[PDB]
Design a binder for this molecule. Structure first.
Ligand code: APC
Ligand code: CL
Ligand code: CL
Ligand code: CL
Ligand code: MG
Ligand code: MG
Length: 535
């Protein structure tokens, strides 16, 4: 890879360097025993660890992984757990013992579990009892897999008993003196644009970056943050674990087994949660609940990431709660990239300014920095100095990593515009923009236009070969419209878009379909549709 060099300490480890500072303050009486992790299941069980208990209990976890499981420094460990405290303990265990943690969603099918296990050559899997049947259907096809570690109230033959081993383990573990650029995590990307990519992160690219970013949410040392996230995604490590614990703040975890928005509302209203992080969908769902009946005067900080925060959602939330939602932007490869900080003015439709380690710019085809107000590719300067926070590269695929470097910049693959104050506005995934008859057409606008029509339940807008190409809509019809003549309905839909947007943006092709392809997270796979359209 030719992408600069870093200015980092030789060694870094979040457990030893950040977390164990807080444990030591408590132990030296320099700080009172302060809550670190507060977990509830929504059924009347709660558990809380202070910083000393977290440190002792996660040292036990490192002992289990390194001792009982025989795992050696650099060994790769898949972690497929729901929102249970053992996820936080196991990840910390991995960090202490110098093991590469590889989190995945419990929402995975057995074919996804096979793909990840095989692709990553995982030596271990840590799972809960609701995924062990799926794991065991495919585990024999995974020749690198040596250890199956189960987190459960029950035992299963073939699986080591985490909870029992944890309790037998010493609360003293000698934390590995891990290198700042040594591999700490592998995150599989969610698969929006294609097969999941294996994104390697270092001890510093996660923990030092998080340390440097600490407090961007508005969180402070005496506060409680609720990050609402699947444990399988990078959001969970960066905001659920690292942000609060860099600050000595408490992280709040609700099992939330059904992701029920009324449960989220009740939780916010019943617990002294000062800050929350969730995808835009969380706020949208909350706005459809009865916010007159469930007040949360304690809540101060509302942040979001993952997709565009609609000005409409921002404005309704403000009206209904008196709070701002502060948007952030990034990707698995880069972590927190742009954000609206606690002190910054909120500009609806904009996702903030560069995160501190980063020179984020809009760049042209040659890698040159563009003036404000010009649409281009969003990029992070990586030469001559690669900033702390950027990942280590795609596992096994250095060609792929190199292919995203343009001149001095890492390409995010997203289009944007930067305003006069340096705020970014997201302008779509670069590969999804349609070029027809010398026009550039973004799919979101066409999709939104289509969705206004009562006939349309869901839609994806993609390029199709023609005039170079043409705008095509895939449309899932409302049941009552399936009986309509499709030629006539196509014309009616084409005419409708032509009336809400620039007429050069209308879908010249419309295909009616019964479902759209989506990732495990529900993101429409436009690439997949596009690939098939071009054949
Ligand atoms: N505030 C925001 N506004 C609009 N889009 C956002 C955003 N924050 C993140 N994103 C989108 O989410 C992407 C990062 O998502 P990731 O979690 O890294 C997996 P993905 O890129 O969807 O899958 P893939 O890499 O497997 O194709 C960004 O590159 C961007 O397109
Ligand atoms: Cl320290
Ligand atoms: Cl729930
Ligand atoms: Cl929204
Ligand atoms: Mg991506
Ligand atoms: Mg509709």
């Amino acid at each position: 890879l030719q992408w600069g060099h870093q200015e980092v300490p030789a060694k870094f480890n979040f457990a030893s360097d950040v977390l164990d500072h807080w444990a030591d303050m408590e132990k030296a009486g320099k700080r009172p025993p302060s809550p670190a992790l507060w977990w509830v299941n929504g059924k009347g069980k709660e558990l809380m660890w202070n910083f000393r208990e977290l440190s002792e209990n996660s040292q036990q976890a490192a002992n289990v992984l390194s001792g009982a499981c025989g795992l050696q420094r650099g060994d790769r460990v898949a972690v497929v757990l729901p929102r249970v405290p053992e996820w936080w303990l196991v990840i910390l265990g991995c960090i202490r013992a110098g093991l590469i943690f590889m989190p995945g969603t419990i929402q995975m099918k057995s074919t996804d579990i096979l793909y990840r296990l095989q692709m990553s050559k995982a030596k271990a899997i840590v799972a809960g009892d609701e995924v062990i049947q799926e794991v065991d259907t495919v585990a024999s096809e995974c020749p690198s897999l040596r250890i199956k570690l189960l987190v459960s109230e029950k035992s299963c033959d073939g699986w080591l008993n985490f909870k029992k081993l944890l309790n037998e383990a010493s609360t003293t573990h000698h934390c590995v003196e891990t290198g700042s650029q040594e591999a700490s995590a592998i995150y599989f990307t969610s698969g929006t644009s294609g097969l999941p990519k294996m994104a390697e992160h270092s001890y510093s690219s996660l923990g030092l970056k998080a340390k440097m970013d600490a407090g961007w949410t508005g969180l402070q040392a005496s506060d409680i943050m609720w990050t609402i996230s699947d444990t399988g995604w990078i959001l969970n490590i960066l905001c659920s674990l690292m942000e609060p614990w860099a600050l000595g703040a408490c992280t709040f975890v609700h099992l939330l087994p059904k992701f029920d928005p009324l449960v989220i509302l009740k939780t916010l209203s019943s617990y002294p949660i000062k800050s929350m992080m969730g995808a835009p969908i969380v706020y949208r769902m909350l706005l459809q609940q009865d916010l007159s009946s469930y007040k949360f005067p304690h809540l101060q900080n509302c942040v979001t990431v993952g997709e565009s925060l609609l000005p409409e959602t921002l404005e309704n939330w403000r009206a209904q709660t008196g709070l701002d939602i502060r948007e952030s932007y990034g990707q698995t490869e880069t972590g927190l990239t742009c954000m609206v900080s606690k002190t910054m003015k909120i500009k609806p439709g904009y996702m903030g300014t560069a995160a501190s380690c980063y020179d984020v710019q809009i760049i042209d085809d040659k890698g040159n920095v563009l003036p404000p107000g010009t649409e281009g590719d969003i990029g992070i300067r990586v030469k001559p100095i690669r900033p702390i926070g950027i990942f280590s590269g795609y596992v096994d695929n250095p060609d792929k990593t190199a292919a995203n470097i343009r001149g001095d910049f890492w390409l995010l693959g997203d289009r944007g515009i930067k305003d006069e104050d340096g705020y970014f506005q997201f302008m779509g995934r670069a590969d999804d923009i349609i070029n027809s008859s010398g026009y550039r057409i973004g799919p979101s606008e066409v999709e939104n236009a289509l969705m206004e029509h009562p006939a349309v339940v869901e839609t994806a807008v993609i390029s199709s070969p023609d005039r170079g190409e043409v705008v095509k809509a895939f449309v899932v019809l409302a049941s009552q419209f399936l009986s309509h003549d499709p030629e006539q309905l196509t014309k009616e839909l084409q005419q409708h878009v032509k009336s809400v947007t620039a007429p050069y943006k209308y879908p010249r092709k419309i295909e009616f379909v019964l479902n759209l392809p989506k990732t495990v997270t529900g993101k429409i796979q436009r690439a997949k549709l596009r690939d098939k359209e071009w054949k």
